[PDB]
Amino acid sequence: DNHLSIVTLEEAPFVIVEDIETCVRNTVPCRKFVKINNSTNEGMNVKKCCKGFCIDILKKLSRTVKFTYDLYLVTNGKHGKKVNNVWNGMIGEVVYQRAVMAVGSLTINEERSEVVDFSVPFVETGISVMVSRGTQVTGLSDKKFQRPHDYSPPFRFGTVPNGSTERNIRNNYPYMHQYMTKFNQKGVEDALVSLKTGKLDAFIYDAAVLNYKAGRDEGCKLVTIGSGYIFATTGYGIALQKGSPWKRQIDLALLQFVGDGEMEELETLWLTGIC
Amino acid sequence: RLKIVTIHQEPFVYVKPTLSDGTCKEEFTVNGDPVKKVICTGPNSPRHTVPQCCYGFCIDLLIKLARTMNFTYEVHLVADGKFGTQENKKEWNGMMGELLSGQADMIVAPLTINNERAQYIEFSKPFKYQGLTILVKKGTRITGINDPRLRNPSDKFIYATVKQSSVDIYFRRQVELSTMYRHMEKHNYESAAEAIQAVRDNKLHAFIWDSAVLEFEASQKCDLVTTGELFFRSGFGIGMRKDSPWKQNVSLSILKSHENGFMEDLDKTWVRY
Numbered sequence: 001d002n003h004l005s006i007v008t009l010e011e012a013p014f015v016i017v018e019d020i021e022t023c024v025r026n027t028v029p030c031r032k033f034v035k036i037n038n039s040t041n042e043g044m045n046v047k048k049c050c051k052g053f054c055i056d057i058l059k060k061l062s063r064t065v066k067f068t069y070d071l072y073l074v075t076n077g078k079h080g081k082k083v084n085n086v087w088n089g090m091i092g093e094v095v096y097q098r099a100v101m102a103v104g105s106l107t108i109n110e111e112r113s114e115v116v117d118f119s120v121p122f123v124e125t126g127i128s129v130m131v132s133r134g135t136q137v138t139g140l141s142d143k144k145f146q147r148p149h150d151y152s153p154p155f156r157f158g159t160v161p162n163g164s165t166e167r168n169i170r171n172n173y174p175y176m177h178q179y180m181t182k183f184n185q186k187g188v189e190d191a192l193v194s195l196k197t198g199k200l201d202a203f204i205y206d207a208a209v210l211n212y213k214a215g216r217d218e219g220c221k222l223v224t225i226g227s228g229y230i231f232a233t234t235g236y237g238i239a240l241q242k243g244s245p246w247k248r249q250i251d252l253a254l255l256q257f258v259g260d261g262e263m264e265e266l267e268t269l270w271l272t273g274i275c
Numbered sequence: 276r277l278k279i280v281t282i283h284q285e286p287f288v289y290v291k292p293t294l295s296d297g298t299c300k301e302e303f304t305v306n307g308d309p310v311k312k313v314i315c316t317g318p319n320s321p322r323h324t325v326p327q328c329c330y331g332f333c334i335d336l337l338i339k340l341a342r343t344m345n346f347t348y349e350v351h352l353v354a355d356g357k358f359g360t361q362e363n364k365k366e367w368n369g370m371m372g373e374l375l376s377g378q379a380d381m382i383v384a385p386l387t388i389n390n391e392r393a394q395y396i397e398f399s400k401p402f403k404y405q406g407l408t409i410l411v412k413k414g415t416r417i418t419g420i421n422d423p424r425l426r427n428p429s430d431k432f433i434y435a436t437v438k439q440s441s442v443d444i445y446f447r448r449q450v451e452l453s454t455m456y457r458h459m460e461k462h463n464y465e466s467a468a469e470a471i472q473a474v475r476d477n478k479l480h481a482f483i484w485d486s487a488v489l490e491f492e493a494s495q496k497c498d499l500v501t502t503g504e505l506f507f508r509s510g511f512g513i514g515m516r517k518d519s520p521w522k523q524n525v526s527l528s529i530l531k532s533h534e535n536g537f538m539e540d541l542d543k544t545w546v547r548y
């Protein structure tokens with residue numbers, strides 16, 4: 001009725017997962033289905049606690065739009081990818097009506113909008129490039145990315161696969177994309193380590209996360225190119241089922257938070273960086 | 276056949292007189308390609324409507340949407356020259372009032388998405404992400420939105436925005452900015468171009484407005500400067516009535532255009548050079 005199944009995914013600082021048996025402080029309860037073993041379908045819901053920028057947005061929406069929720073962490077993939085014409089990840093949970101909405105660092109793009117509705121964006125994102133300070137690269141259009149074997153040694157650059165960034169590169173730059181896959185990074189933390197130790201020259205990824213990591217990088221050695229330039233500007237959105245009756249109220253509430261100054265508080269709390 | 280309403284606002288919408296034969300002069304972009312122009316009707320006090328020439332970022336976007344969604348259109352300039360605010364009873368002026376009254380079917384302009392308008396119309400996903408900044412004459416020293424000459428104002432330093440715009444409402448709605456709103460209420464201008472010119476002529480000391488516009492003005496006019504960065508993020512969307520059958524494909528097309536580089540091309544053609 002008024003009690004909604006909501007899916008999220010850990011990605012600091014937008015969603016941060018901690019252990020608990022009562023969640024305290026600025027945290028909200030969230031469950032994670034953990035398998036017993038790999039020869040079974042049996043699992044157990046572990047009770048954990050969630051906080052972060054997108055959790056504070058969900059709290060505000062819950063209070064303002066007036067709903068309650070049971071928050072859970074996706075276990076079938078990550079943000080969302082269509083595999084053999086079937087959506088997985090947070091998008092999949094919404095498409096297949098296991099969640100009423102998805103809340104987190106979820107990028108709005110065209111193909112996802114064909115299967116879910118999105119709220120208005122509320123965090124600016126897109127595709128940025130993170131490098132060591134001083135690296136001479138113009139952008140995604142740089143020939144070092146577009147025609148990497150024109151250079152000896154070639155530029156080493158990768159992304160974390162299966163999200164909105166890899167989808168966009170695969171669609172727009174086929175040669176770059178097929179070159180890139182050998183530099184696939186399992187996650188953001190691995191990629192930052194590769195950058196700092198000189199095993200990677202560039203890390204192409206979600207603009208808002210790179211902006212966050214650049215702002216908190218030790219010694220401010222790692223930067224986004226073009227003073228934080230973003231290709232294919234978009235935003236994080238709340239994903240809802242197609243035709244959701246909650247979309248209009250969520251949109252108006254987000255726009256109210258913006259207009260009344262409430263979003264600045266969340267940005268200052270979660271998104272500021274020393275660099 | 277869709278009635279498009281827009282508004283004069285360089286570099287998103289240029290408005291020029293037609294030639295003596297009713298056609299629009301052949302011109303070429305910074306990249307060497309021809310400038311796509313459309314005839315747009317509008318006023319030049321009575322509002323005598325006459326055909327004129329429209330082009331720029333928003334007209335290129337309209338042409339793209341029309342070609343990709345298969346609709347025809349007629350463009351006109353908003354009769355009262357305003358973007359649109361809601362002023363016992365309440366009424367919408369500007370492009371908002373024209374879209375709600377049926378004088379237009381779609382708003383294609385640098386139209387800011389806010390809660391007030393979204394209550395009454397449907398916005399596309401944003402076709403441009405930007406924000407608010409401050410334009411001053413070169414030599415004027417203010418730090419930004421928190422400068423004492425703005426937060427503790429006097430008649431020695433005059434600042435303003437455009438009447439019946441989203442920015443006017445931004446200052447009206449937040450009590451934390453009431454001291455500024457009461458200063459600006461006495462000095463707000465009828466259009467952005469009049470405010471920009473007033474800054475150039477040292478009759479307005481600071482103009483608070485959309486950064487996509489102000490930064491373009493500063494890139495072209497070397498005696499104008501912005502105060503730095505954005506104190507508030509905002510975005511432009513296409514506006515349609517809530518029952519429009521075109522709304523979902525409009526929004527999908529905007530996303531496709533961000534994703535395949537089309538919006539970036541427009542940005543290089545019209546905004547950054």
Ligand SMILES: O=C(NC1(c2cnccn2)CC1)c1cnc(OCC(F)(F)c2cccc(Cl)c2)cn1
Nearest residue numbers: 120121122123124235258263267388401508509510
């Ligand atoms: O300023 C906002 N969000 C914060 C932010 C964003 N990016 C990075 C850091 N902080 C402070 C949290 C914000 C502004 N306007 C919103 O709605 C209007 C819009 F949809 F047109 C739009 C315009 C411009 C940007 C965006 Cl995202 C959305 C939603 N959110």
Ligand SMILES: N[C@@H](CCC(=O)O)C(=O)O
Nearest residue numbers: 079106107163164165206
């Ligand atoms: N935000 C992205 C994940 C990271 C990326 O691929 O850039 C998404 O929603 O898929």
